[PDB]
């Protein structure tokens, strides 16, 4: 099928700091992430969330696995899914493979990439339809991990998107904007 990426990025393209988010917790932005990644109208099926190993451990243990979603972790030097994770794959291809194998066949509604820099960079270059759900955190934040540039040659910003607020949001005195990008490539 198609892939969704979801990310929140500072104005300096930061996504991470010290294995956590660069900004303080934004409850309603987290609830947006939860709603977008969890929402599945197909009764009997759940969404697949795919993430790198560091992203997995950046989720507080009490929120692992991400409830109402199939949690799959990518790791090349791990051979059991980390404690609480539903699946492990050695590559994005292997994770997508898994979708049409007995483990996940007719179990998976949508696929959400939530995983770190390398997972996004690869997902973003994957053939077929891609949507990037990008929360623009409209402050600079000190960050050690960054979201790759969005290639405008293939990706276009959609002006609005059904189910996504169009106006700038503000929580805990931090403004942000929900964006959705799309390629057909
Ligand atoms: N929206 C956001 O703001 C957002 C989203 C995600 C993460 N973050 C933040 O970013 C940081 C974590 O992201 P990160 O980029 O540092 O790490 P990450 O991509 O979650 O994890 C890196 C590790 O995951 C595994 N991995 C990554 N790509 C893989 C692939 N294609 N195949 C197999 N395994 C793969 C590797 O593990 P092995 O070494 O075991 O092979 C790699 O060392 C944290 O600070 C987190 O809070 C923020
Ligand atoms: N838009 C967006 N915002 C983010 O903060 C985000 N974070 C990651 C990676 N980090 C995290 C960290 C924590 C949780 C988390 O705790 N999620 C819970 C929230 C539950 C609650 O608020 O009580 C969840 O159920 O989804 C998810 C991803 C990936 N994509 C993102 N995308």
CSV table of C-alpha atoms and ligand atoms in Angstrom, one decimal:
chain,number,residue,atom,x,y,z
A,1,UNK,CA,0.0,0.0,0.0
A,2,UNK,CA,1.1,3.6,1.0
A,3,UNK,CA,3.2,4.9,3.9
A,4,UNK,CA,2.5,7.8,6.3
A,5,UNK,CA,5.4,9.6,8.1
A,6,UNK,CA,4.5,11.7,11.2
A,7,UNK,CA,7.1,14.0,12.9
A,8,UNK,CA,7.3,17.2,14.9
A,9,UNK,CA,10.3,19.4,13.9
A,10,UNK,CA,11.8,22.7,15.4
A,11,UNK,CA,12.5,25.6,13.0
A,12,UNK,CA,16.1,24.4,13.0
A,13,UNK,CA,14.8,21.0,11.8
A,14,UNK,CA,15.5,19.4,15.2
A,15,UNK,CA,13.5,16.2,16.3
A,16,UNK,CA,15.6,15.0,19.2
A,17,UNK,CA,17.8,16.0,22.2
A,18,UNK,CA,19.4,13.5,24.7
A,19,UNK,CA,17.1,10.7,23.5
A,20,UNK,CA,13.9,12.8,24.2
A,21,UNK,CA,12.1,15.6,22.4
A,22,UNK,CA,13.9,19.0,22.2
A,23,UNK,CA,10.8,20.9,23.4
A,24,UNK,CA,8.9,20.4,26.7
A,25,UNK,CA,5.8,18.0,26.5
A,26,UNK,CA,3.0,19.4,24.3
A,27,UNK,CA,-0.1,17.3,25.5
A,28,UNK,CA,-2.4,18.1,22.5
A,29,UNK,CA,0.4,17.6,20.0
A,30,UNK,CA,1.1,14.2,21.6
A,31,UNK,CA,-2.7,13.5,21.4
A,32,UNK,CA,-2.6,14.5,17.6
A,33,UNK,CA,0.3,11.9,17.2
A,34,UNK,CA,-1.7,9.3,19.1
A,35,UNK,CA,-5.0,10.1,17.1
A,36,UNK,CA,-3.2,10.1,13.7
A,37,UNK,CA,-1.2,6.9,14.3
A,38,UNK,CA,-4.0,5.0,16.2
A,39,UNK,CA,-7.1,6.0,14.1
A,40,UNK,CA,-8.4,3.0,12.0
A,41,UNK,CA,-12.1,2.8,10.9
A,42,UNK,CA,-11.7,-0.8,9.7
A,43,UNK,CA,-13.1,-3.0,12.6
A,44,UNK,CA,-10.8,-6.0,13.4
A,45,UNK,CA,-7.6,-4.2,12.2
A,46,UNK,CA,-5.0,-1.8,13.8
A,47,UNK,CA,-2.3,0.6,12.4
A,48,UNK,CA,1.4,-0.6,12.2
A,49,UNK,CA,3.8,1.9,13.8
A,50,UNK,CA,7.4,1.4,12.5
A,51,UNK,CA,10.3,3.1,14.5
A,52,UNK,CA,14.1,2.9,15.0
A,53,UNK,CA,15.4,1.4,18.3
A,54,UNK,CA,16.3,4.8,19.9
A,55,UNK,CA,12.8,6.2,19.1
A,56,UNK,CA,11.4,3.0,20.9
A,57,UNK,CA,13.4,3.7,24.1
A,58,UNK,CA,12.6,7.5,23.8
A,59,UNK,CA,8.9,6.5,24.5
A,60,UNK,CA,8.4,6.4,28.3
A,61,UNK,CA,8.1,2.7,29.4
A,62,UNK,CA,4.5,3.1,30.8
A,63,UNK,CA,3.4,4.2,27.2
A,64,UNK,CA,5.1,1.1,25.6
A,65,UNK,CA,3.9,-0.5,23.5
A,66,UNK,CA,1.9,2.4,22.0
A,67,UNK,CA,-1.6,1.2,22.8
A,68,UNK,CA,-4.2,0.4,20.0
A,69,UNK,CA,-1.3,0.1,17.5
A,70,UNK,CA,1.0,-2.8,16.3
A,71,UNK,CA,4.5,-1.6,17.4
A,72,UNK,CA,7.4,-2.8,15.1
A,73,UNK,CA,11.1,-1.8,15.9
A,74,UNK,CA,13.9,-1.7,13.3
A,75,UNK,CA,17.3,-2.9,14.6
A,76,UNK,CA,20.2,-4.7,12.7
A,77,UNK,CA,21.9,-5.8,16.0
A,78,UNK,CA,18.8,-7.0,17.9
A,79,UNK,CA,17.1,-10.5,17.4
A,80,UNK,CA,14.2,-10.2,19.8
A,81,UNK,CA,11.6,-7.4,19.8
A,82,UNK,CA,12.6,-5.1,22.7
A,83,UNK,CA,10.5,-5.7,25.9
A,84,UNK,CA,6.8,-4.8,25.0
A,85,UNK,CA,7.3,-4.3,21.2
A,86,UNK,CA,5.1,-6.5,19.0
A,87,UNK,CA,7.6,-7.1,16.1
A,88,UNK,CA,11.3,-6.6,15.1
A,89,UNK,CA,12.6,-6.2,11.5
A,90,UNK,CA,16.2,-5.7,10.1
A,91,UNK,CA,15.1,-3.3,7.3
A,92,UNK,CA,12.0,-1.2,6.3
A,93,UNK,CA,11.5,-3.7,3.3
A,94,UNK,CA,11.4,-6.6,5.9
A,95,UNK,CA,8.8,-4.6,8.0
A,96,UNK,CA,6.7,-3.9,4.8
A,97,UNK,CA,7.2,-7.6,3.7
A,98,UNK,CA,5.7,-8.6,7.1
A,99,UNK,CA,2.4,-6.8,6.2
A,100,UNK,CA,1.5,-9.5,3.5
A,101,UNK,CA,2.9,-12.5,5.6
A,102,UNK,CA,0.7,-14.5,8.1
A,103,UNK,CA,1.9,-12.5,11.1
A,104,UNK,CA,0.2,-9.2,9.9
A,105,UNK,CA,-2.0,-10.4,6.9
A,106,UNK,CA,-5.5,-8.7,7.3
A,107,UNK,CA,-4.3,-7.3,10.8
A,108,UNK,CA,-2.9,-3.9,9.4
A,109,UNK,CA,-5.1,-0.9,8.3
A,110,UNK,CA,-2.5,1.9,7.8
A,111,UNK,CA,1.4,2.0,8.2
A,112,UNK,CA,2.9,5.0,10.2
A,113,UNK,CA,6.7,5.7,10.1
A,114,UNK,CA,7.5,7.4,13.5
A,115,UNK,CA,11.1,6.2,13.6
A,116,UNK,CA,14.3,8.4,13.8
A,117,UNK,CA,16.2,10.3,11.1
A,118,UNK,CA,17.4,7.3,9.0
A,119,UNK,CA,13.9,5.7,9.0
A,120,UNK,CA,12.3,9.0,7.7
A,121,UNK,CA,15.1,9.6,5.1
A,122,UNK,CA,14.5,6.0,3.7
A,123,UNK,CA,10.7,6.1,4.0
A,124,UNK,CA,10.7,9.6,2.2
A,125,UNK,CA,12.6,8.0,-0.7
A,126,UNK,CA,10.3,4.8,-0.8
A,127,UNK,CA,8.4,4.4,-4.2
A,128,UNK,CA,4.6,4.9,-4.3
A,129,UNK,CA,2.4,7.4,-2.5
A,130,UNK,CA,3.9,9.0,0.7
A,131,UNK,CA,2.3,11.5,3.1
A,132,UNK,CA,4.4,13.5,5.6
A,133,UNK,CA,2.4,14.7,8.6
A,134,UNK,CA,4.8,17.4,9.8
A,135,UNK,CA,4.2,19.5,13.0
A,136,UNK,CA,6.2,22.7,12.5
A,137,UNK,CA,7.3,23.7,16.1
A,138,UNK,CA,7.7,27.4,15.4
A,139,UNK,CA,10.7,28.0,17.7
A,140,UNK,CA,14.4,27.0,17.4
A,141,UNK,CA,15.3,24.2,19.9
A,142,UNK,CA,18.8,22.8,20.7
A,143,UNK,CA,18.8,19.3,19.0
A,144,UNK,CA,21.3,16.5,18.4
A,145,UNK,CA,19.1,14.7,15.8
A,146,UNK,CA,17.3,16.3,12.8
A,147,UNK,CA,14.6,15.6,10.1
A,148,UNK,CA,16.1,15.4,6.6
A,149,UNK,CA,15.3,18.3,4.2
A,150,UNK,CA,11.9,17.6,2.4
A,151,UNK,CA,12.7,17.2,-1.4
A,152,UNK,CA,10.3,19.8,-3.1
A,153,UNK,CA,11.1,18.0,-6.5
A,154,UNK,CA,8.7,15.2,-5.3
A,155,UNK,CA,6.9,16.6,-2.2
A,156,UNK,CA,4.3,19.4,-2.2
A,157,UNK,CA,2.6,21.0,0.9
A,158,UNK,CA,-1.2,20.5,0.9
A,159,UNK,CA,-3.1,23.8,1.7
A,160,UNK,CA,-5.4,22.0,4.2
A,161,UNK,CA,-6.1,18.4,5.1
A,162,UNK,CA,-9.4,16.9,6.4
A,163,UNK,CA,-9.1,16.0,10.1
A,164,UNK,CA,-6.0,18.2,10.5
A,165,UNK,CA,-6.4,21.8,12.0
A,166,UNK,CA,-5.1,24.5,9.6
A,167,UNK,CA,-4.6,27.4,12.1
A,168,UNK,CA,-1.4,27.8,14.1
A,169,UNK,CA,-1.8,26.0,17.5
A,170,UNK,CA,-0.2,27.1,20.9
A,171,UNK,CA,0.5,25.0,24.0
A,172,UNK,CA,2.7,25.8,27.0
A,173,UNK,CA,3.5,29.2,25.2
A,174,UNK,CA,4.9,27.3,22.2
A,175,UNK,CA,3.2,27.9,18.8
A,176,UNK,CA,3.1,25.1,16.2
A,177,UNK,CA,1.4,24.4,12.8
A,178,UNK,CA,0.2,21.0,11.4
A,179,UNK,CA,1.3,20.5,7.8
A,180,UNK,CA,0.8,17.5,5.4
A,181,UNK,CA,3.2,16.9,2.4
A,182,UNK,CA,2.5,14.4,-0.4
A,183,UNK,CA,4.5,13.0,-3.4
A,184,UNK,CA,3.1,10.8,-6.2
A,185,UNK,CA,6.4,9.3,-7.3
B,1,LIG,N1,8.8,13.6,15.8
B,1,LIG,C1,9.8,13.7,16.6
B,1,LIG,O1,10.1,14.8,17.0
B,1,LIG,C2,10.7,12.5,16.7
B,1,LIG,C3,10.5,11.3,16.1
B,1,LIG,C4,11.3,10.2,16.3
B,1,LIG,C5,12.4,10.4,17.2
B,1,LIG,N2,12.6,11.5,17.8
B,1,LIG,C6,13.7,11.7,18.7
B,1,LIG,O2,14.9,11.3,18.0
B,1,LIG,C7,15.8,10.5,18.8
B,1,LIG,C8,15.8,9.1,18.2
B,1,LIG,O3,16.0,9.1,16.8
B,1,LIG,P1,17.3,8.6,16.1
B,1,LIG,O4,17.4,9.0,14.7
B,1,LIG,O5,18.4,9.1,17.0
B,1,LIG,O6,17.3,7.0,16.2
B,1,LIG,P2,16.3,5.9,15.6
B,1,LIG,O7,16.3,6.0,14.1
B,1,LIG,O8,15.0,5.8,16.4
B,1,LIG,O9,17.1,4.7,16.1
B,1,LIG,C9,18.4,4.4,15.6
B,1,LIG,C10,18.6,2.9,15.6
B,1,LIG,O10,17.5,2.3,15.1
B,1,LIG,C11,17.9,1.2,14.2
B,1,LIG,N3,17.6,1.6,12.8
B,1,LIG,C12,17.4,2.8,12.3
B,1,LIG,N4,17.1,2.7,11.0
B,1,LIG,C13,17.1,1.4,10.7
B,1,LIG,C14,16.9,0.5,9.5
B,1,LIG,N5,16.6,1.1,8.3
B,1,LIG,N6,17.0,-0.8,9.6
B,1,LIG,C15,17.3,-1.4,10.8
B,1,LIG,N7,17.5,-0.7,11.9
B,1,LIG,C16,17.4,0.6,11.9
B,1,LIG,C17,19.4,1.1,14.4
B,1,LIG,O11,19.5,0.2,15.5
B,1,LIG,P3,20.7,-1.0,15.7
B,1,LIG,O12,21.9,-0.1,16.0
B,1,LIG,O13,20.2,-1.8,16.8
B,1,LIG,O14,20.7,-1.6,14.3
B,1,LIG,C18,19.8,2.5,14.8
B,1,LIG,O15,21.1,2.5,15.5
B,1,LIG,C19,15.2,10.7,20.2
B,1,LIG,O16,15.7,11.9,20.8
B,1,LIG,C20,13.7,10.9,20.0
B,1,LIG,O17,13.1,11.5,21.1
B,1,LIG,C21,11.8,12.6,17.6
B,2,LIG,N1,3.8,14.8,15.5
B,2,LIG,C1,4.7,14.1,16.3
B,2,LIG,N2,4.9,14.5,17.5
B,2,LIG,C2,5.8,13.8,18.3
B,2,LIG,O1,6.0,14.2,19.5
B,2,LIG,C3,6.4,12.6,17.8
B,2,LIG,N3,7.3,11.9,18.5
B,2,LIG,C4,7.8,10.8,17.9
B,2,LIG,C5,8.7,9.9,18.7
B,2,LIG,N4,8.6,10.1,20.1
B,2,LIG,C6,7.5,9.8,20.9
B,2,LIG,C7,7.5,10.0,22.2
B,2,LIG,C8,6.4,9.7,23.0
B,2,LIG,C9,5.2,9.1,22.4
B,2,LIG,C10,4.0,8.8,23.3
B,2,LIG,O2,4.1,8.7,24.5
B,2,LIG,N5,2.8,8.6,22.7
B,2,LIG,C11,1.6,8.3,23.4
B,2,LIG,C12,1.0,9.5,24.1
B,2,LIG,C13,0.0,9.0,25.2
B,2,LIG,C14,-0.4,10.1,26.1
B,2,LIG,O3,-0.3,11.3,25.7
B,2,LIG,O4,-0.9,9.8,27.2
B,2,LIG,C15,0.7,7.6,22.5
B,2,LIG,O5,-0.2,6.9,23.0
B,2,LIG,O6,0.8,7.8,21.2
B,2,LIG,C16,5.2,8.9,21.1
B,2,LIG,C17,6.3,9.2,20.3
B,2,LIG,C18,7.5,10.4,16.6
B,2,LIG,N6,6.6,11.2,15.8
B,2,LIG,C19,6.1,12.3,16.4
B,2,LIG,N7,5.2,13.0,15.7
